[PDB]
Amino acid sequence: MDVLYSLSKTLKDARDKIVEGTLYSNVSDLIQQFNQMIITMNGNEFQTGGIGNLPIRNWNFNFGLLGTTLLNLDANYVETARNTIDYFVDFVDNVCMDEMVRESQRNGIAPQSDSLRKLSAIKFKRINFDNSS
C-alpha cells in the first residue's frame, strides 16, 4: 500500500514537474526517485485482473534511467520520460482496480491482489518517497 502510493506519487510528480524547458534543479530529486523506482521495478513481472470482467494484464519492466546531464529539459527528455510514465500509470491503474474489486472476511486490511502482495515485499521498500496524502 505504501509502495503503491509511492509509485502513484512519483508518477504524478513526474507528469507535473517533468515539462519542457524546466530547470533541471526543479526536478533533480524527483529524477533520483524515478530512477530508483525504475531500478527497483526492472526485471519483475506482474499480473492483474481475472476477477469479473476485469481483463487479465501482464506487466514487464525494462526501462532506461532518465538522464541527469541537462541544464534545462528539452523535448527529447520529456518524450523519453513520457513513455515510461504512461506505462507505469497504466500499471498503477490496473493494480488499484484489481485491489479495489477484492475483499476478504478475515484480514481485510491485508493486501488481496497478487500485484500488491508482491509489492509488499522487502525488495520494493526502496521506493517510499513521501506519504503526504
Binding site: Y24, Q32, N35, T68, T69, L70, L71
Partner: protein
C-alpha cells in the same frame, strides 16, 4: 614442465594485465599509508575577480571630461575567443575555485588598519584599505562617503568569539566570500566527539583501557571525515577494480595483524610428528610459516580477498590440518574449485575410506559440495555433525554502526566447534579403515591423533584468531562486501599445519596504537574516496551543464582513479572505465560544490561581458547607423542588444562546417548579427571610419570557411583621436554600417560595494582526533574474549 610453466605464466599475464594492482603488491602499503587527510585551508586574502579601475570619460560631444571616474574591471582579463572556449575558461575557473575554496576563515589575520580612520579602525583586506585610501583622496567622492570611510569601525567581541570587519568588494566577489564565511567546514570538538569517534567495539572491549587525559578548549575545531558508504558499488560488475581494492585492503590488514609469540619448539614438534607418522610431509613446518598462515587468514577475512588452497593430496597431514581450516574459516572465503578440491581429497583419502564407503565421484558444478553430500551419506553422529557445521558455516552479514560486517558463528568465536572437530577426528582414528594397507592406516590415524591431542591448543588458536579478527574488523569503515575475486591469495596447507602444530600458549592481541593506526588509515582512505567521487561528479556535472560537448569524461575518470592512489589506471579495462563514467554521471552533486557552481553559472554572463578583450558579437545591418555617444568613448558602434537582426551562432556555424547561409547573406548584403565571443580591433581614426573600414572584415569568412579569424572593428572616436577635427569642424553625422555587441563596464558604487564580513575571532583546528586518547592494554595473559573468559585458557 618448463614449457607448462611458460604457458601458465603467459595465460596469467593475459589475465593480470587487466587488473590494476601495482606490480609488487608490497608498495600498496606505502601508498595507502601515504594517503593523508586533506589539510584544512585558511583564506589568506579575500577572493576577488574585479578591482576598481579609474578610467577616463568623455562629454557627449566627444571631448575628454577632465574628470576620470571609477569603474569595475576584471583583475585578470584573459577570456578567449569563441563561446566554447569561454565556457571552457569558466569550467577551469570553477575548478580553481574548488581547489582554493577555504575550509575556515579568521578575518583578524587579514585585517589591516584604515589610514584615514579617526577611531583606530581596521578593514578586512589590504585591497580594501587601498581602495578606501583612493576614494578618500579622490575629489569626486561624496562628503557622506568620505565621512563614512573616516568613521567606519570594526567590532571584535572576544566574549562571544566573533569579529565584524568592513570590506569593499564587487557583488560577485562578496557572494563568493560570504559563501566561504557562512559555510565553513569546521565544527566544535569535544571529548565526547573524540570518544564517539573511537570505534564502539573497542570502547566496550575490556582489554583496552581508554582515558581522556587531555583538555579540549572551547575554541577547538575539526573537520569531520566524509564516511558515506560507497556510491559507485564497486563490488557490482567492477571485477578488476574490486580485485585491486581487496588486494590493497589485504596488504594493509597483513601489516596490522600481530605476530605470534613463543610457539612450540619446531625441532621437538617435527621430531614427534616424524615419530608418529613413521614415514618409512614434514616439509614447510616452521614458525615463519605459522605466522604467515595466521596473518594470511586474518587479513584475507578482513579484506574479503578470496583465498585459494594449495596442497599435495599425498600429504594427508596437510589434509588433516585443512579439516581444522575448513571448520574455523567460513567456506565462502575460498574459491569454489579449491574448496571442492580440498573437501574431495579429505573425503576420498580419509573419511569415506575410514568408514568403508566407496569413494565419491564428485561432479564439478554440482550445487552441493563434497561435504554436503557426505553429511547426508554418513551415519556416524560425530563426523556427520562436524560436516554439517562445516557445510553451513558461512559469514553472517550484520550492519554495525552503519557499516556492513562479515561476522563469524559464535561457536567458532568462542572456539567450541573444535571440540566437535576432535570428536570426529577421534572417531576416524579409531575407525577400522577396511581394506587399507595396515601401515598406511596406522600412519593416517596417528596423523589424525596428532591434531586431536591438540584440542586445548586448537581451541585457544581458534578463539585467538576470532578475537583478533573482531578487534581489527571494528576498525574497518567501508562495507565488507563479499565477492569472488579474479585473483586469489594462495594459502599453503603446510603453513596451516605449521600454525596448528606450533601454536603455543601466549595471547597476542593488537596494540591500541596499532588499532588506532589501522582505523586512521581506513578512515583516510574512505574520506579520500568520497571526496574524489565528489570532485569527479562535480566536474562532470559542471561540464554537462556548461555544454562542453568536446569534453572526454574518460579523462575525469582517469584522474579519479589516479587520485584514489591504489589503482594502476593504465590497466583498468575499457568497459569498466565507461561503466564508472556512467555511474558517476548519475550521482547528485555535493552541496558546497554545487552552490559554488551555481554562483559561477549565474555570474559568468556578467564576467564575460565585463571582459575587455572580447565582444559578444557583431551586427552588420548594411545601412547607415548613427554612432552612439557613450561616456567610455565619444563615438562607438556599440550595440546593446541584437533586436531586429537575424542571428547566426558562430559556434554552431564553425561546428557544422556548412557556410551556405552566411555566404549567401554576405554575398547578397542581407542584415545579420553574428553572435559569439569575438576579438575586436579598436580603431580611433576618423578617416578610417570615413573609409568604411569596418565593413571589409567579413570576406575572409567566405574565402576560408572559418570564423575564428573574424575580428570586427570597434570605432572609438574621441578628442584624443588625432582626427577629431573632422568631426568637430564639419557638419556631418558619423555613421558606421556595423556595430559591436558589447557592454559598458559596471560603475563603482561605494554604498553597494561596502559590506560587513563577520567570522570567529580565533580557534584551533585539529586533525589526528585520536592523539587525545590515551590507550593502554591489559596484560596479555589475562585478556578475555567476547564471552568474558581468557582468550587462551590452556595455561
Amino acid at each position: 614442465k618448463t614449457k607448462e610453466e611458460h604457458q601458465k605464466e603467459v595465460q596469467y599475464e593475459i589475465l593480470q594485465k587487466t587488473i590494476p594492482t601495482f606490480e609488487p603488491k608490497e608498495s600498496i602499503l606505502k601508498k595507502l599509508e601515504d594517503i593523508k587527510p586533506e589539510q584544512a585551508k585558511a583564506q589568506t586574502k579575500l577572493f576577488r575577480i574585479f578591482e576598481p579601475r579609474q578610467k577616463p570619460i568623455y562629454i557627449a560631444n566627444g571631448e575628454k571630461e577632465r574628470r576620470n571616474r571609477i569603474y569595475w574591471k576584471l583583475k585578470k582579463d584573459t577570456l578567449p575567443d569563441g563561446d566554447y572556449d569561454v565556457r571552457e575558461y569558466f569550467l577551469n575557473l570553477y575548478d580553481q575555485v574548488l581547489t582554493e575554496m577555504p575550509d575556515y576563515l579568521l578575518l583578524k589575520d587579514m585585517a589591516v588598519e584604515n589610514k584615514n580612520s579617526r577611531d583606530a579602525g581596521k578593514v578586512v583586506d589590504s585591497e580594501t584599505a587601498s581602495i578606501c585610501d583612493a576614494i578618500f583622496q579622490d575629489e569626486e567622492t561624496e562628503g557622506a562617503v568620505a565621512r563614512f570611510i573616516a568613521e567606519m569601525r570594526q567590532r571584535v567581541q572576544a566574549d562571544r568569539n566573533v569579529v565584524n570587519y568592513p570590506s569593499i568588494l564587487h557583488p560577485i566577489d562578496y557572494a563568493f566570500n560570504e559563501y566561504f564565511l557562512q559555510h565553513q567546514l569546521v565544527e566544535p570538538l569535544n571529548n565526547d566527539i573524540i570518544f564517539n569517534y573511537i570505534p564502539e567495539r573497542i570502547r566496550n572491549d575490556v582489554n583496552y583501557i581508554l582515558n581522556m587525559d587531555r583538555n579540549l578548549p572551547s575554541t577547538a575545531r575539526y573537520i569531520r571525515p566524509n564516511l558515506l558508504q560507497d556510491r559507485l558499488n564497486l563490488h557490482d560488475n567492477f571485477e578488476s577494480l574490486w580485485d585491486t581494492i581487496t588486494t590493497s585492503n589485504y596488504i594493509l590488514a597483513r601489516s596490522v595483524v600481530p605476530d605470534l609469540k613463543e610457539l612450540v619448539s619446531t625441532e621437538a614438534q617435527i621430531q614427534k610428528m616424524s615419530q608418529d607418522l613413521q614415514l618409512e610431509f614434514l616439509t614447510g613446518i616452521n614458525s615463519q610459516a605459522a605466522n604467515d598462515c595466521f596473518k594470511t587468514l586474518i587479513a584475507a577475512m578482513l579484506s574479503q580477498r578470496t583465498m585459494s588452497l594449495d596442497f599435495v593430496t599425498t600429504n594427508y597431514m596437510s589434509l588433516i590440518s585443512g579439516m581444522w581450516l575448513l571448520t574455523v574459516v567460513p567456506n565462502d572465503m575460498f574459491i569454489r574449485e579449491s574448496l571442492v578440491a580440498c573437501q574431495l581429497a579429505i573425503v576420498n583419502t580419509i573419511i569415506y575410506v575410514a568408514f568403508g564407503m566407496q569413494r565419491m565421484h564428485y561432479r564439478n558444478g554440482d550445487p552441493q559440495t563434497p561435504f554436503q553430500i557426505a553429511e547426508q551419506q554418513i551415519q556416524n553422529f560425530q563426523v556427520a555433525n562436524w560436516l554439517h557445521f562445516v557445510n553451513n558455516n558461512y559469514f553472517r552479514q550484520v550492519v554495525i554502526d552503519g557499516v556492513l560486517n562479515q561476522v563469524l558463528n559464535d561457536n567458532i568465536r568462542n572456539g567450541h566447534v573444535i571440540n566437535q572437530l576432535m570428536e570426529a577426528l577421534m572417531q576416524l582414528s579409531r575407525q577400522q579403515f577396511p581394506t587399507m594397507p595396515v601401515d598406511y592406516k596406522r600412519s593416517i590415524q596417528r596423523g589424525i591423533l596428532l591434531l586431536s591431542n591438540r584440542l586445548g591448543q586448537l581451541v585457544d588458536l581458534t578463539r585467538l584468531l576470532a578475537y583478533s579478527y573482531e578487534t581489527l574488523m571494528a576498525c574497518v569503515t567501508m562495507n565488507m562486501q563479499h565477492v569472488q575475486t579474479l585473483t586469489t591469495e594462495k594459502l599453503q596447507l603446510t603453513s596451516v599445519t605449521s600454525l596448528c602444530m606450533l601454536i603455543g600458549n601466549a595471547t597476542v592481541i593488537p596494540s591500541p596504537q596499532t588499532l588506532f593506526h589501522y582505523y586512521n588509515v581506513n578512515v583516510n582512505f574512505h574520506s579520500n574516496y568520497n571526496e574524489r567521487i565528489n570532485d569527479a561528479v562535480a566536474i562532470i556535472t559542471a561540464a554537462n551543464r556548461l555544454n562542453l560537448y568536446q569534453k572526454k569524461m574518460k579523462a575525469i575518470v582517469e584522474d579519479f582513479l589516479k587520485r584514489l592512489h591504489i589503482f594502476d589506471v593504465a590497466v583498468a579495462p575499457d568497459d569498466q572505465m565507461y561503466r564508472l563514467r556512467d555511474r558517476l554521471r548519475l550521482l547528485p552533486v555535493e552541496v558546497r560544490r554545487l552552490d559554488i557552481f551555481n554562483l559561477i553559472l549565474m555570474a559568468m554572463d556578467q564576467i564575460e561581458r565585463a571582459s575587455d578583450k572580447i565582444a559578444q558579437g557583431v551586427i552588420i545591418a548594411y545601412r547607415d547607423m548613427q554612432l552612439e555617444r557613450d561616456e567610455m568613448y565619444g563615438y562607438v558602434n556599440i550595440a546593446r542588444n541584437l533586436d531586429g537582426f537575424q542571428q547566426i551562432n558562430l559556434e554552431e556555424l564553425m561546428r557544422t562546417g556548412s557556410y551556405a547561409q552566411i555566404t549567401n547573406m554576405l554575398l547578397n548584403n542581407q542584415p545579420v548579427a553574428l553572435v559569439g565571443a569575438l576579438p575586436f580591433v579598436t580603431d580611433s581614426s576618423v578617416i578610417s571610419l570615413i573609409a568604411i573600414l569596418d565593413a571589409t572584415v567579413f570576406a575572409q569568412i567566405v574565402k576560408l570557411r572559418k570564423v575564428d579569424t573574424l575580428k570586427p572593428i570597434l570605432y572609438k572616436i574621441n578628442s584624443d583621436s588625432n582626427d577629431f577635427y573632422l568631426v568637430a569642424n564639419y557638419d556631418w553625422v558619423p555613421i558606421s554600417t556595423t556595430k559591436v555587441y558589447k557592454q559598458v563596464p559596471v560603475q563603482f558604487d561605494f554604498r553597494n560595494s561596502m559590506h560587513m564580513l563577520t567570522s570567529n575571532l580565533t580557534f584551533t583546528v585539529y586533525s589526528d582526533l585520536l592523539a587525545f586518547v590515551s590507550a593502554d592494554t591489559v596484560e596479555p595473559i589475562n585478556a578475555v574474549a567476547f564471552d568474558n573468559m581468557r582468550i587462551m585458557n590452556e595455561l
